[PDB]
Every structure is written in structure tokens, then in C-alpha cells.
Amino acid sequence: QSVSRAAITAAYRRPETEAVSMLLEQARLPQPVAEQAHKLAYQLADKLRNQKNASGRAGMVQGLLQEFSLSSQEGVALMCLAEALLRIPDKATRDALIRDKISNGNLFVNAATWGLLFASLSRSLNRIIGKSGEPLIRKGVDMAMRLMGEQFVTGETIAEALANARKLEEKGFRYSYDMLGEAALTAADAQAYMVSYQQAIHAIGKASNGRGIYEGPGISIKLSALHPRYSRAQYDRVMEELYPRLKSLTLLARQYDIGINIDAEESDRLEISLDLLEKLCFEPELAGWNGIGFVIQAYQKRCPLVIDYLIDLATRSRRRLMIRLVKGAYWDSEIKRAQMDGLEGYPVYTRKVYTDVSYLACAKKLLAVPNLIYPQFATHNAHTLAAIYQLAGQNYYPGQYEFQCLHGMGEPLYEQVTGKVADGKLNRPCRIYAPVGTHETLLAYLVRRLLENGANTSFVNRIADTSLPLDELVADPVTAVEKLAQQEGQTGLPHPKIPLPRD
Ligand SMILES: Cc1cc2nc3c(=O)[nH]c(=O)nc-3n(C[C@H](O)[C@H](O)[C@H](O)COP(=O)(O)OP(=O)(O)OC[C@H]3O[C@@H](n4cnc5c(N)ncnc54)[C@H](O)[C@@H]3O)c2cc1C
């Protein structure tokens, strides 16, 4: 094993106090940069929360919830009457109603819409459940999956989604298309996925039409879709069978000069994906071409060591690697997986703030080597974006880096980001990750979107919480870790509720 590969393996389940301590100074923003990151993070989160004046309207609510000293139920009912009084066409009649008959007695149609500014279903469920059974539960889950999943899908076929590309692409967005589907269980499954990926590359590459890997659209692929039972696949079978499919897809992407990105999945597959990447990078037919993309997950303890490996690989193979830095999508599964195995520790962090610190340290490592790596910073977190904006230094050039976001999640934040400075934008490119597929391929992806959007540690969840002040929402992660350090007695202790798998 090479030097960089060996250091990866040694960091696999490093104790959290040790790994967070090492990361801390690598992630610390210098005082002037930290200041500018704070102001920018604050300003992005302010426009985000207060689009359509959501805070200022809640302000006028509380200011009258006290001025008359009324309840919340007793105050929404006042609006329903106020709305119904504003519907009297003539002010003469409206006022005379208030000064004559508005002290005796008495509609609440829009009490629900007003309540959004200010039970017995368990019975209807118990009745329906035992009556219609498991087939009713299975249909309810399938319906709710499509209903909640619609917002995250750009189209059922690649052609449908490609036809939606111009709107935001003319605004300066880019796209990475994902043919939904993963964890192939049979040879037939992985074959079908292979053909789905090939057809997508032809379609995406004809749409790209020479625009190249930076400005033009790319594709994202999941290795688990290409090999049957990837989760437990032996090394020799993966090289013999998966690798020639990865190679074939990458050659095809090169012919069209489009970016081809290898998504990161569960942590027990990191090692074998590095082996496939190492081989792919030395194919003669790919010499001189920089379209190979690779995702790395900052919630893993190995991420910084993976970066030193990737830096050495780009040098040895004479290319610029497209590296998408993400926090990670499989955190709940990682925790549960590690607890069932009862091993030395976790391969991921157990406090969200540690992942934030890991992401900022890794971002610094990536931005230090623009000749070897084109960093792609995938995030919906206003502070994370603002910190990367400042970390990247003055004198941005389009090929220095890009942001990325998921379809259905990033658009309000990146409306402030991609576009002209004259229109109030930061003028930074963003690549939209665009899932494509029908209902039969949506389940696993929708669930990870639900876990992401529904966690109270997620930025997109906290920002909807108007009782959380903006300064706490965009608080600096290194400073947060040192707060816990001072309160708890040492830096980087595991989450209090997530004991080691052996405890
Ligand atoms: C364009 C794009 C492509 C992506 N591709 C991939 C991919 O190929 N593979 C993949 O795994 N992820 C991928 N992701 C990331 C994943 O899907 C989430 O979108 C991402 O992790 C959210 O980070 P955020 O900075 O927007 O949110 P933030 O809310 O600031 O952070 C949320 C993240 O913190 C982490 N986290 C939550 N709780 C804890 C905890 N208690 N301890 C430690 N860490 C915690 C999780 O990673 C969670 O997603 C991608 C994201 C984007 C935007």
C-alpha cells in the first residue's frame, strides 16, 4: 500500500477527540476572513428567511399580539373578522358597522391561512388500517413517496430534463444529471442501469455540443448501480466486471467532452472506489482529459487523507481532477451500521458541527492546489457557502471552483449567488444535481432527502425556524467546537447520545 493509501486506512475509525483536534487549526478562518464570512452568511440567510418579508410580517403579528394582549387562537379570529370587514365595498358602511353593531355579536374561512402567520386522526387511521390492511399501507407509502419526491426530480426521462436546461443555464447555472437508480441486486438490474447511463451520456453530450466539462452539462453515476450486490462485492469481481463498465462510460463521456462524476455512497465502499479511480485515471484513451469527477464526503474521518491521496493521483496521472466536496447523505445509515458491527468506532463524525469543521478544513486543502483539482463545493448552508467564497481569495476566475446544489433545495440560496453583480448576485457558478427517473427509481433518494430536510441539525431545517436567530444559524463552526471544548472539558467529544458501538 502506498503512503497516502496507508494513511487513509489508518484514519478509518479514528477517535473523534483526536480527529476533531487535528482538523481545528486547518479549519480556522483568519479573523478578517471570519468577519467577512459572517457578514456574508448573515446577509444570505437574511434574504433567505425574509423572502416575501416572512420575518417582518411575523414582527407586525407579535407587535399586536401584545398591544391588545390577546391569544394566538383569539388573535387569528380577529384577522378573519378584519378580512371580512375589508370586504364591505364602501367605507361608510364598514365604519358604521364598527361604531354601531360591532359590540353585540355576530366567516372564519381563511383562518388556516391566517394561522400560518400566527388528534382524532389516530381513530380514522386505526379504523382504516385494520380494515384495508398492509396493501393499503403499501399504497399509502408509494403515493406519499411520489408526492413528496416530485420537487426533487427534474424529469422522468433524460430528454424531458434536458429540455428544461436552458432556463437556468442562460442564467449561468450548470447541470449534473443523475439517472436515478442504485444498489443493483441482479445482473439484469446492473445491465439495465448500464444502458440507462449510456443513453444518458449520448443525450447529454449532444446537448452539450462542445461546451466542455466546465460550462456544459455532465453526468453523475453510482457504482452500486453498475454491479450486482455492490454492497458485498469482492475486489477481483469488481475489477473484472464493474471496471470495464466504468471505463466504457468514461471514454464515451470523453468523446462528448462532458464531465462524468462518481457519486460517493456508503463508507465501506470508499476503498474499492479509490481502486477503480486509480485505474481509470491511467487509461491511455483518457490521457490529457480532465473530465473525471469524484465525490468525497467530509463527514468521514478519512476525507482529509483521501484528499492527500487525490492530490498525489492527479500529479502521477497528469490531470486536473473534478472533486465534489460534500458533507454526506448516508449519516443515519452509517451510525446504525457501525453500531451493529460493534467495532472500535464510527467512520463518520457524531456531532454535526464536526462535519462542518471537516468540510472547511477540506475546502482549504482543495483550494490550495488549483493546478491539480477543480473543487466543486456542494452545499445548501449559507455559512458554508460564504466561508468558501472568502476562503477562495480575491481574484476569482470561472475555472477556480464552482458551487453545487440539489434540484429542489438550493434555488432560493443560489438565486443570490449565480448571476451578474449588477443584479445583486455574487457572480459564482452553481451546478444543479438533477435526478432523472420514474417512480420505480425514486425511493432511496427521496428517503435521504427526507432525512436531510427533516433533521433539526440541517441548515435548511433550522432556517425555516424563525425562533432561531440568524447569528446562531450562521455561527462559525470552529468557534462552536471550542465552546463545547470549554464547556465539556476537552475538544471533540462524541455526541452525548451516540456512545461508541461497544458501550
Ligand atoms: C449537488 C450535491 C451533490 C451531492 N452528492 C453526494 C454524494 O455523491 N454522496 C453523498 O453521501 N452526499 C452527497 N451530497 C450531500 C448530501 O446529499 C447533502 O446534500 C449534504 O450533506 C448537505 O450538506 P449541507 O451543507 O447543504 O447541509 P448542512 O445542513 O450544513 O449539513 C447537513 C449534513 O451534516 C451531516 N450531519 C448531520 N448530522 C450529523 C451528526 N450528528 N454528526 C455528524 N454529521 C452530521 C450530514 O452530512 C448532513 O447531510 C451532495 C450534495 C449536493 C448539494
Distance in angstroms (rounded) separating the CA atoms of residues 405 and 409: 7
Residue with the three cell numbers 453498475: 226
Dihedral over alpha carbons 140, 145, 146, 147 (to 10 degrees): 80
As given in the structure block, the three cell numbers for residue 144 are 406519499
Residue 376 CA: which ligand 1 atom is closest?
A: 1
The DSSP letter of residue 300 is B
Judge contact between 298 and 359, C-beta under 8 A: yes
User: For atom 17 of ligand 1, which residue has the closest CA?
Assistant: 329
- CA-wise closest residue to 299 among 270, 329, 324: 329
User: For atom 44 of ligand 1, which residue has the closest CA?
Assistant: 352
Distance in angstroms (rounded) separating the CA atoms of residues 80 and 109: 7
What is the 448 CA–ligand 1 centroid distance (Å)? 10
Judge contact between 325 and 378, C-beta under 8 A: yes
If one residue of 327, 445, 446, 497 were mutated to test the ligand 1 pocket, choosing by the most ligand atoms within 8 A of its CB, it would be 327
Distance in angstroms (rounded) separating the CA atoms of residues 383 and 349: 19
Distance in angstroms (rounded) separating the CA atoms of residues 385 and 43: 12
Distance in angstroms (rounded) separating the CA atoms of residues 185 and 230: 8
Give whole-number Cα distances, 92 to 81, 139, 187, in Å: 17, 56, 78
Distance in angstroms (rounded) separating the CA atoms of residues 292 and 253: 9
What is the 325 CA–ligand 1 centroid distance (Å)? 10
| Coil, strand or helix at 259 | coil
As given in the structure block, the three cell numbers for residue 367 are 483550494
User: For atom 25 of ligand 1, which residue has the closest CA?
Assistant: 379
User: For atom 43 of ligand 1, which residue has the closest CA?
Assistant: 352
User: For atom 40 of ligand 1, which residue has the closest CA?
Assistant: 352
- CA-wise closest residue to 290 among 298, 304, 303, 280: 280
Distance in angstroms (rounded) separating the CA atoms of residues 407 and 405: 7
- CA-wise closest residue to 294 among 226, 283, 313: 313
Q: Where are the alpha helices (DSSP H) in 455-476?
A: 459-462, 470-473
Residue 330 CA: which ligand 1 atom is closest?
A: 11
User: For atom 32 of ligand 1, which residue has the closest CA?
Assistant: 458
**Residues in CB range of 131: below 8 A, 6 or more apart:** none
Sign, Cα dihedral of 225, 229, 231, 233: negative
Query: DSSP per residue over 35-100, as a string?
Result: HHHHHHHHHHHHHHHTTTSHHHHHHHHHHHHHHTT--SHHHHHHHHHHHHHTTSS-HHHHHHHHTT
**What backbone torsions phi and psi does residue 129 show, to the nearest 5 degrees?**
-65, -60
**Residues in CB range of 398: below 8 A, 6 or more apart:** 214, 429
Judge contact between 149 and 442, C-beta under 8 A: yes
Residue 354 CA: which ligand 1 atom is closest?
A: 43
148 beta partners: none
In this structure, the residues whose C-beta lies within 6 A of any atom of ligand 1 are: 263-264, 295, 297, 299, 324, 326-331, 348-352, 354-355, 378-381, 384, 404-406, 433, 452, 455, 457-459, 495
Please state the domain extents for the chain: 1-503
How many Cα atoms are found within 13 Å in the side-chain-facing hemisphere of 55? 15
Query: DSSP per residue over 426-441, as a string?
Result: ----EEEEEEE--GGG
Give the strand pairing for 292-297 and 218-221.
unpaired
Residue 380 CA: which ligand 1 atom is closest?
A: 26
Taking the alpha carbons at both ends of the chain, their separation in whole angstroms is 33
Distance in angstroms (rounded) separating the CA atoms of residues 66 and 205: 61
Give whole-number Cα distances, 43 to 27, 49, 51, 396, 417, in Å: 22, 10, 12, 20, 12
What experiment produced this structure? X-ray
**Residues in CB range of 360: below 8 A, 6 or more apart:** 27, 29, 384, 387, 391, 477, 478
Residue type for position 299:
Y
As given in the structure block, the three cell numbers for residue 39 are 457578514
As given in the structure block, the three cell numbers for residue 221 are 453515476
Distance in angstroms (rounded) separating the CA atoms of residues 287 and 277: 14
3-state secondary structure 338-361: HHHHCCCCCCECCCHHHHHHHHHH
Distance in angstroms (rounded) separating the CA atoms of residues 385 and 37: 9
What is the 174 CA–ligand 1 centroid distance (Å)? 20
As given in the structure block, the three cell numbers for residue 75 are 388573535
User: For atom 1 of ligand 1, which residue has the closest CA?
Assistant: 405
If one residue of 296, 299, 326 were mutated to test the ligand 1 pocket, choosing by the most ligand atoms within 8 A of its CB, it would be 326
Distance in angstroms (rounded) separating the CA atoms of residues 366 and 451: 28
Residue 350 CA: which ligand 1 atom is closest?
A: 42
Judge contact between 350 and 494, C-beta under 8 A: yes
Distance in angstroms (rounded) separating the CA atoms of residues 492 and 503: 18
- CA-wise closest residue to 477 among 406, 372, 350, 387: 387
**Residues in CB range of 292: below 8 A, 6 or more apart:** 250, 260, 262, 277, 280, 281, 286, 319, 321, 322
- CA-wise closest residue to 158 among 181, 178, 140: 178
Classify the phi-psi angles of 492: left when phi > 0, otherwise alpha if psi is within -120 to 50, otherwise beta. Answer: left
Residue type for position 432:
I
